[PDB]
Automatic annotation (TrEMBL), chain A:
The gene is eryAI. Homodimer. Erythronolide synthase is composed of EryAI, EryAII and EryAIII multimodular (2 modules) polypeptides each coding for a functional synthase subunit which participates in 2 of the six FAS-like elongation steps required for formation of the polyketide. Module 1, 2, 3, 4, 5, and 6 participating in biosynthesis steps 1, 2, 3, 4, 5, and 6, respectively. Involved in the biosynthesis of antibiotic erythromycin via the biosynthesis of its aglycone precursor, 6-deoxyerythronolide B (6-dEB). It comes from Saccharopolyspora erythraea (Streptomyces erythraeus). This is 6-deoxyerythronolide-B synthase. It comes from the Bacteria. The chain holds residues 1443 to 1915 of 3545 of the full protein.
Length: 473, 92, 48, 49
């Protein structure tokens, strides 16, 4: 029945956790540091270590506190000596600080630790143990979307220091049996998985798999008012234009710049021509009360059901300077804004809460390491929202044809070793199809596997792309 | 070898001309199986038990209810066949 | 094997872990907030 | 070029939804081959050509 949506079918993609091998167990040597905190006694440390000295090496503890410094762990690792790898148990059973999702202490400690092994000339793979930071599928549930940010930054780190980064090892929340059962083979595995999700039914590796598009008859309409966060920005701008074209009744493009944006008036005029009763507003999204009073100021004549979060601030994503608070004040407009919108819309019957993320999380991205964690938090938030009674769609867009929100130096670099600007005239249809399926986390990319994987699986061979049929080429 | 039969048992205390019929199979048709009972300076029951092993391994259908006709042997639970499984899935 | 199944009953382990991913199941149209959406399942796991 | 008439045989990559292979062929190299080259830089490429 369809020919034009064949382009969309090859656009939209999904991240599926296929059961990989638990790795080839090799008798380790030297030492393997269990880097973690010291506030609470953790049985996770003992459960991990019991198969660590049994793996041939010895277990040394590396206590790291929030922003202890980008060097402390470096001279500590130099003092202990040569190390064959480090287990980051600093992201275990840790609650999200409600101040900011990216202010998560585990993210900051992991970044500082990574740069510590970089400046310490140690050259050992680093493994970060997480507790259900990424659901092994919609059947499973994410406990903390903020922890999924560590996963995103870890996917980025693999493309910077292949020897320093080992990967991430996800385990179920509360249970430590999977650690003792698999960690020894996982860390030393000759398989090469950089993304591990240990569960009771086995071990699962992150995989890129095609998303089928039979063009389901269900149609999503923009009926109601549309809260386009960062609407003036191109990522939000083309979305608003498509909403107006489709027949969106109300539009509520909201950004801090707002009326003071370079292109606000023209965009508003275009929306009024295509649609009707559109509104632009200069309102902060980071503050919870700002969004609360913004939704309170949303006229009661129309309910809110189309919150489309697109705002994203970005300056640089290089790991050498990347610390937790840097990512925090870089992508707060993403993470805190999405958290406030979700917390405010639990009580709202949203037909769409599309969180606009990027491929910075979908796969590794140099120069987007400060951007990826925000995109990942969005993905985890959508995975959590779909488990409860709130539809969500975390589309990981490519570089936008016209925007500058993520269109920077990294955009043109990836244009010359990978993806380019997705056409809006088909990206809009891809979003329409993703909302037709209520897809939890679409990955709508214009990926050119042949030339893209020549710079990806080069430094770090992976199976993340070993599920796409055309990814063999 | 032309009579449909492909295996031969060199019944003797030592297998003289062992590779000769192997030479026959090497240069004609398919390679034949040289099974022998004993060997020079090798006449223990372990060697004959080893002779039974090479007979079975070379295709000789040994009657295993006759080797164990009575020895005080009882059935024991053992692991089943290790099916070398490969992913064969048909998608709709 | 029947002997490994006794290692599941004697120590009180539940086999309900989650939905299979080998089979190429969509897993994304299987769960929606609307319980009456055609194409969606209600159980978030099961022993597979 | 050998004779006295300037010529320029630019090879092209599909642009947006208005390419020269636009359709299944475009959608396939859009996964394993040539990329959607923006007109804003393709025009300058032709200009310098």
């Amino acid at each position: 029945r369809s020919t034009e949506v064949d382009e969309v079918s090859a656009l939209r993609y999904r991240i599926e956790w296929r059961p990989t091998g638990a790795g080839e167990p090799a008798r380790l040597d030297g030492t393997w540091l269990v880097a973690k905190y010291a506030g609470t006694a953790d049985e996770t440390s003992t459960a991990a270590r019991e198969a660590l000295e049994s793996a041939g090496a010895r277990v040394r503890e590396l206590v790291v506190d929030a922003r202890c410094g980008r060097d402390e762990l470096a001279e500590r690792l130099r003092s202990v000596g040569e190390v064959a790898g480090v287990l980051s148990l600093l992201a275990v059973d840790e609650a999200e600080p409600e101040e900011a999702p990216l202010a998560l202490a585990s993210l900051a400690d992991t970044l500082s630790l990574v740069q510590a092994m970089v400046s310490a000339e140690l050259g050992c793979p680093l493994w970060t143990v997480t507790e259900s930071a990424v659901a092994t599928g919609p059947f499973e549930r994410v406990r903390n979307a903020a922890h999924g940010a560590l996963w995103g930054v870890g996917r980025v780190i693999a493309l910077e220091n292949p020897a320093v980064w080992g990967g991430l090892v996800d385990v179920p929340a509360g249970s430590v049996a999977e650690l003792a059962r698999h960690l020894a083979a996982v860390v030393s595995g000759g398989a090469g998985e950089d993304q591990l999700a240990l569960r009771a039914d086995g071990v699962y590796g992150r995989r890129w798999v095609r998303a089928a598009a039979p063009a389901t008859d269900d149609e999503w309409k923009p009926t109601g008012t549309v809260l386009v966060t960062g609407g003036t920005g191109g990522v939000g701008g083309q979305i608003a234009r498509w909403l107006a074209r489709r027949g969106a009744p109300h539009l509520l493009l909201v950004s801090r710049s707002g009326p003071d944006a370079d292109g606000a008036g023209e965009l508003v005029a275009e929306l009024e021509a295509l649609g009707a009763r559109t509104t632009v507003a200069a309102c902060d999204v980071t503050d919870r009360e700002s969004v609360r009073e913004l939704l309170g100021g949303i006229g009661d004549d129309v309910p809110l059901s189309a919150v489309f979060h697109a705002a994203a601030t970005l300056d640089d994503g290089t790991v050498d300077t990347l610390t937790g608070e840097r990512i925090e004040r870089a992508s707060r407009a993403k993470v805190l804004g999405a958290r406030n919108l979700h917390e405010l819309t639990r009580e709202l019957d949203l037909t769409a809460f599309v969180l606009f993320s990027s491929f910075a999380s979908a796969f590794g991205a140099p120069g987007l390491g400060g951007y990826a964690p925000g995109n990942a938090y969005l993905d985890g938030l959508a995975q959590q929202r779909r488990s409860d009674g709130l539809p969500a769609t975390a589309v990981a867009w490519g570089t936008w044809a016209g925007s500058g929100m993520a269109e920077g130096p990294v955009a043109d670099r990836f244009r010359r070793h990978g993806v380019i600007e997705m056409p809006p005239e088909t990206a809009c249809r891809a979003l329409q199809n993703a909302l037709d399926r209520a897809e939890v986390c679409p990955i709508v990319i214009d990926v050119r596997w042949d030339r893209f994987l020549l710079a990806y699986t080069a430094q770090r061979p992976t199976r993340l792309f070993d599920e796409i049929d055309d990814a063999r080429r | 070898a032309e009579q449909g039969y492909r295996t031969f048992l060199e019944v003797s205390a030592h297998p003289i001309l062992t590779a000769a019929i192997e030479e026959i199979g090497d240069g004609s048709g398919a390679d034949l199986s040289a099974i022998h009972s004993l060997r020079r300076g090798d006449g223990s029951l372990a060697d004959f038990g080893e002779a039974l092993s090479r007979a079975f391994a070379a295709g000789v259908a040994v009657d295993w209810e006759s080797v164990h006709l009575g020895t005080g042997a009882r059935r024991v639970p053992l692991p089943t066949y290790p099916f070398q499984r490969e992913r064969v899935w048909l998608e709709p | 094997t029947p002997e490994e199944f006794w290692e599941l009953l004697s120590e009180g382990r539940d086999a309900v872990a989650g939905l299979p991913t080998d089979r190429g199941w969509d897993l994304d149209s299987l769960f929606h907030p609307d319980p009456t959406r055609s194409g969606t399942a209600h159980q978030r796991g099961g022993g597979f």
